[PDB]
Design a protein around this ligand. Sequence first.
Ligand SMILES: *[C@@H]1O[C@H](CO)[C@@H](O[C@@H]2O[C@H](CO)[C@@H](O)[C@H](O)[C@H]2NC(C)=O)[C@H](O)[C@H]1NC(C)=O
Ligand SMILES: *[C@@H]1O[C@H](CO)[C@@H](O[C@@H]2O[C@H](CO)[C@@H](O)[C@H](O)[C@H]2NC(C)=O)[C@H](O)[C@H]1NC(C)=O
Ligand SMILES: CO[C@]1(C(=O)O)C[C@H](NC(C)=O)[C@@H](NC(C)=O)[C@H]([C@H](O)[C@H](O)CO)O1
Ligand SMILES: CO[C@]1(C(=O)O)C[C@H](NC(C)=O)[C@@H](NC(C)=O)[C@H]([C@H](O)[C@H](O)CO)O1
Ligand SMILES: CO[C@]1(C(=O)O)C[C@H](NC(C)=O)[C@@H](NC(C)=O)[C@H]([C@H](O)[C@H](O)CO)O1
Ligand SMILES: CO[C@]1(C(=O)O)C[C@H](NC(C)=O)[C@@H](NC(C)=O)[C@H]([C@H](O)[C@H](O)CO)O1
Ligand SMILES: *[C@@H]1O[C@H](CO)[C@@H](O)[C@H](O)[C@H]1NC(C)=O
Ligand SMILES: *[C@@H]1O[C@H](CO)[C@@H](O)[C@H](O)[C@H]1NC(C)=O
Ligand SMILES: *[C@@H]1O[C@H](CO)[C@@H](O)[C@H](O)[C@H]1NC(C)=O
Ligand SMILES: *[C@@H]1O[C@H](CO)[C@@H](O)[C@H](O)[C@H]1NC(C)=O
Ligand SMILES: *[C@@H]1O[C@H](CO)[C@@H](O)[C@H](O)[C@H]1NC(C)=O
Ligand SMILES: *[C@@H]1O[C@H](CO)[C@@H](O)[C@H](O)[C@H]1NC(C)=O
Ligand SMILES: *[C@@H]1O[C@H](CO)[C@@H](O)[C@H](O)[C@H]1NC(C)=O
Ligand SMILES: *[C@@H]1O[C@H](CO)[C@@H](O)[C@H](O)[C@H]1NC(C)=O
Ligand SMILES: *[C@@H]1O[C@H](CO)[C@@H](O)[C@H](O)[C@H]1NC(C)=O
Ligand SMILES: *[C@@H]1O[C@H](CO)[C@@H](O)[C@H](O)[C@H]1NC(C)=O
Ligand SMILES: *[C@@H]1O[C@H](CO)[C@@H](O)[C@H](O)[C@H]1NC(C)=O
Ligand SMILES: *[C@@H]1O[C@H](CO)[C@@H](O)[C@H](O)[C@H]1NC(C)=O
Ligand SMILES: *[C@@H]1O[C@H](CO)[C@@H](O)[C@H](O)[C@H]1NC(C)=O
Ligand SMILES: *[C@@H]1O[C@H](CO)[C@@H](O)[C@H](O)[C@H]1NC(C)=O
Ligand code: NA
Ligand code: NA
Ligand SMILES: [Zn+2]
Ligand SMILES: [Zn+2]
Lengths: 369, 369
Amino acid sequence: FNEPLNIVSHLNDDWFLFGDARSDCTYVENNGHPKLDWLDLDPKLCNSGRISAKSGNSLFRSFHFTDFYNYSGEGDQVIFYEGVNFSPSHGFKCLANGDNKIWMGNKARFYARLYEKMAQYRSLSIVTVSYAYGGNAKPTSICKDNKLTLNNPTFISKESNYADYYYVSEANFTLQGCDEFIVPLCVFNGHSRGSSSDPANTYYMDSQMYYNTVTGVFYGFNSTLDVGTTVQNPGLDLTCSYLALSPGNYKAVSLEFLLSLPSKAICLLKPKRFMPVQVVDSRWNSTRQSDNMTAVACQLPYCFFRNTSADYSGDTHDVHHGDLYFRQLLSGLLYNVSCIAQQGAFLYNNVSSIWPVYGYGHCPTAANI
Amino acid sequence: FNEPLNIVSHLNDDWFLFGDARSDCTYVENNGHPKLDWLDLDPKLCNSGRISAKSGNSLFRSFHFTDFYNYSGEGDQVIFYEGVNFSPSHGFKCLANGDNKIWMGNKARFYARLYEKMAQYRSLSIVTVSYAYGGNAKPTSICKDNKLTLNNPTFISKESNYADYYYVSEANFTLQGCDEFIVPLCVFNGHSRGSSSDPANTYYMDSQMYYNTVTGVFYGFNSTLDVGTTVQNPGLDLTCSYLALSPGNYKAVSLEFLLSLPSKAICLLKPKRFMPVQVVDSRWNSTRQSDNMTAVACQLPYCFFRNTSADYSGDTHDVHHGDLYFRQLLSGLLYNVSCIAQQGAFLYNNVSSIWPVYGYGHCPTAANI
Ligand SMILES: *[C@@H]1O[C@H](CO)[C@@H](O[C@@H]2O[C@H](CO)[C@@H](O)[C@H](O)[C@H]2NC(C)=O)[C@H](O)[C@H]1NC(C)=O
Ligand SMILES: *[C@@H]1O[C@H](CO)[C@@H](O[C@@H]2O[C@H](CO)[C@@H](O)[C@H](O)[C@H]2NC(C)=O)[C@H](O)[C@H]1NC(C)=O
Ligand SMILES: CO[C@]1(C(=O)O)C[C@H](NC(C)=O)[C@@H](NC(C)=O)[C@H]([C@H](O)[C@H](O)CO)O1
Ligand SMILES: CO[C@]1(C(=O)O)C[C@H](NC(C)=O)[C@@H](NC(C)=O)[C@H]([C@H](O)[C@H](O)CO)O1
Ligand SMILES: CO[C@]1(C(=O)O)C[C@H](NC(C)=O)[C@@H](NC(C)=O)[C@H]([C@H](O)[C@H](O)CO)O1
Ligand SMILES: CO[C@]1(C(=O)O)C[C@H](NC(C)=O)[C@@H](NC(C)=O)[C@H]([C@H](O)[C@H](O)CO)O1
Ligand SMILES: *[C@@H]1O[C@H](CO)[C@@H](O)[C@H](O)[C@H]1NC(C)=O
Ligand SMILES: *[C@@H]1O[C@H](CO)[C@@H](O)[C@H](O)[C@H]1NC(C)=O
Ligand SMILES: *[C@@H]1O[C@H](CO)[C@@H](O)[C@H](O)[C@H]1NC(C)=O
Ligand SMILES: *[C@@H]1O[C@H](CO)[C@@H](O)[C@H](O)[C@H]1NC(C)=O
Ligand SMILES: *[C@@H]1O[C@H](CO)[C@@H](O)[C@H](O)[C@H]1NC(C)=O
Ligand SMILES: *[C@@H]1O[C@H](CO)[C@@H](O)[C@H](O)[C@H]1NC(C)=O
Ligand SMILES: *[C@@H]1O[C@H](CO)[C@@H](O)[C@H](O)[C@H]1NC(C)=O
Ligand SMILES: *[C@@H]1O[C@H](CO)[C@@H](O)[C@H](O)[C@H]1NC(C)=O
Ligand SMILES: *[C@@H]1O[C@H](CO)[C@@H](O)[C@H](O)[C@H]1NC(C)=O
Ligand SMILES: *[C@@H]1O[C@H](CO)[C@@H](O)[C@H](O)[C@H]1NC(C)=O
Ligand SMILES: *[C@@H]1O[C@H](CO)[C@@H](O)[C@H](O)[C@H]1NC(C)=O
Ligand SMILES: *[C@@H]1O[C@H](CO)[C@@H](O)[C@H](O)[C@H]1NC(C)=O
Ligand SMILES: *[C@@H]1O[C@H](CO)[C@@H](O)[C@H](O)[C@H]1NC(C)=O
Ligand SMILES: *[C@@H]1O[C@H](CO)[C@@H](O)[C@H](O)[C@H]1NC(C)=O
Ligand code: NA
Ligand code: NA
Ligand SMILES: [Zn+2]
Ligand SMILES: [Zn+2]
């Protein structure tokens, strides 16, 4: 009786879900498909006011790239069912001889910070960050490929009067109107190039730091790897850490190569008593390559991870949308449960065959009578 | 039935207590006092092998000062009953016109890091940290008063050939043999002085950073305050942050004033599934001044704080040792409890009048039947 259920759910109506096409009731198509057949989410929840979901997008994608959706929502119990729209299938690298594995590392670090913080705050949104820069140089899109253009962090070009990239540069940015801010601090970790026409032996070791002008605390990232931009010595790409910062005026200081600074932040608002987030595995049908970086990110005590036992097997829309087992996993959002724990959700508050571990809510005992 | 108990306890025999005189069975006195009358700990636990406690000491005191006890112990459920041996009663400042409130801030930040980490590791000890320094200058005891001498971090003197303190200096240190290390990164935040004979208008703005040579990550602290070393402009003292670092070779870089680096670290070993620490309020009889910095440090989800409802009222030894209510609070270490939660310990695993919140162990229900 009352065994843990492999679902995501909620203790009361104070919940919120962040998603992609599989939770996006506003997507439109014109064909002979059944209505809303791309959904894993139950159509009854489309008008709940508790969903922020966009076909083709993810939190990581909107945070870093020009393909932007303003994910926003507030709840005590926060659930995520997204991530797949930045995966190894996309194969993103900043440069021709870059490394998607670095980008998978970035994915894991971003989601780990996000989940940790969303166990402690009710409200999430994505805000623009402005800068003040004393020179005439403008932003440059150093990191992109044929389908995605990175725009966070911003990279400022070299000033015209400088002959090389061995310069110090800086700009200030303001973080205002949120309790905490997640921003990226990144570096090209390796031997960077100014231009293709430069001598083979001239390269740069990118350095970047952010400095709080009031408190005087700074966090920094220097290049240490031997990887580069050529076929002979490949592997250079953009490594990012994700910092949780208090409101204030900040100084971005670059000691070598291009200045970078945040253009977007995750805005965190309204502290709550600690409540773990729930994360649903977000993957393709195995005809495409997926990753487990959200699983790497989802750790105790701040996150509970839920997954099915099968390939993602689309019903009518295509192979990648409308899976029976993910539909059943999400069906727990249709009702309240007594307790949400590591093993799953416990429907009833009284007795179970299994002891809940890391239980939240009104949890049952597994004692006799 | 089975209401939460205001005690510290354990789920099984896999527990450990860090303490001071009130848990130290090895202290000796020669008088007409009853045997072991300074203890709050039950004498039955003196030979348990689960206690690391020293009269006159605390974790913070041994971490920072020459009055050192090698606190060491391992357990799944970790309990702390210490802290009072660095308090406002001691009135410690690095300098004549310093600020004990800065030192209380340091106390809170140290214990917050320690409690957080001891919810995630079984084993704690204090290890020495060595350095490599390319100059001839030796350590100097810049921070002390009439009863305490700070020795962590170490401060290296100016080289003889330098005329002033506007120099860059560095030294490397190795962290080896632990899974993680807590070390202090500190700065004199204000207008520092080279010497009393210097012109009134010459002062220094202390800067310090630690840099991981392999990964290239650095963490830094610059001076920003206007406080100083004189009666006219007082308040300068040593502000410290407490960093959790992985094993490796590190570089301490000082851009101004004296170079500082770790001489001691908290050695963290043996990852465990998340289990909150229990902290007992550590204060004097109110004839002396206490602080609540361990309470500020003890936050959810990593720590449960326990306190009595009375002044600390010593029985026979003196006013500061052997309190009835603290004796009863610690008596929970004599037996196992089913569940340890935010409200207190629940003895039985089946039913209670109260729903456990943030429960660990085999927790009861408050449902009917
Ligand atoms: C991080 O990288 C920067 C940029 O290369 C380093 O700054 C230079 O360091 C070298 C020697 O260490 C000096 O010769 C340069 O004059 C420094 N400044 C500039 C503006 O180039 C910086 O030292 C590195 N950080 C650490 C902690 O080693
Ligand atoms: C932290 O403080 C150090 C030491 O004062 C700063 O280093 C100096 O900065 C000024 C201008 O910002 C330069 O004129 C000096 O030449 C710098 N170097 C040295 C060795 O004095 C450092 O800039 C401060 N950090 C930040 C992020 O502002
Ligand atoms: C090419 O792949 C994507 C896209 O990159 O936008 C992925 C979307 N999937 C998710 C999970 O967000 C997919 N949406 C649906 C309803 O099929 C869309 C959609 O097929 C196209 O925008 C229109 O065909 O395409
Ligand atoms: C496309 O390849 C590269 C190159 O290897 O030359 C990548 C460089 N980026 C890094 C991180 O090493 C890029 N540098 C700048 C400052 O834009 C240069 C540059 O854009 C071009 O060579 C044009 O000068 O191009
Ligand atoms: C002066 O205060 C202290 C000390 O600074 O060491 C505090 C000790 N208290 C704690 C809680 O650790 C106290 N211990 C006992 C058993 O009385 C000792 C002790 O009185 C002296 O070492 C010997 O009298 O003195
Ligand atoms: C005792 O007072 C002070 C002072 O104000 O002169 C404190 C200084 N410390 C700070 C942090 O400002 C100290 N400086 C050094 C480098 O030792 C000097 C110095 O020891 C003496 O003046 C002897 O030169 O003394
Ligand atoms: C996103 O929505 C939030 C909530 O209204 C808002 O504060 C924020 O400025 C928006 N961001 C962008 C980039 O439109
Ligand atoms: C950035 O802030 C610093 C410190 O307050 C200031 O000195 C500097 O002038 C600012 N930068 C710009 C471009 O205004
Ligand atoms: C993610 O996948 C890798 C490679 O298969 C594996 O080593 C790792 O344990 C996985 N992590 C999680 C949390 O599932
Ligand atoms: C989820 O389950 C599928 C099928 O069992 C498996 O391929 C996938 O690796 C699992 N996800 C994670 C993050 O381990
Ligand atoms: C993908 O989805 C289809 C259709 O649901 C399913 O039959 C198949 O098992 C899945 N996997 C692969 C590799 O085709
Ligand atoms: C969930 O509980 C709330 C009260 O906390 C109630 O308003 C709501 O109707 C419940 N939801 C369902 C689907 O029964
Ligand atoms: C709960 O367990 C205790 C200890 O065995 C017992 O005294 C009590 O009767 C039990 N209560 C119920 C409702 O089973
Ligand atoms: C403290 O004890 C531990 C455990 O034996 C040991 O590893 C460490 O080196 C000791 N530290 C000092 C400073 O004696
Ligand atoms: C400290 O390490 C750095 C980087 O590996 C090295 O360049 C430097 O020589 C070392 N310092 C000393 C004093 O050996
Ligand atoms: C500590 O004491 C201060 C001053 O009385 C008070 O403002 C603060 O709330 C206290 N904090 C805790 C956690 O008890
Ligand atoms: C513990 O209780 C005493 C007496 O009620 C009180 O003075 C003290 O401030 C309490 N401790 C904290 C940390 O609040
Ligand atoms: C301190 O301890 C004594 C002796 O136990 C007790 O009577 C008194 O109430 C306590 N407080 C003060 C301020 O003396
Ligand atoms: C606590 O439980 C353990 C078994 O987990 C047992 O060995 C021990 O005797 C118990 N302690 C007491 C004081 O009963
Ligand atoms: C637990 O609660 C459910 C729902 O009311 C009920 O069906 C069941 O009989 C209860 N079990 C016990 C032992 O009270
Ligand atoms: Na840079
Ligand atoms: Na310094
Ligand atoms: Zn369709
Ligand atoms: Zn005595």
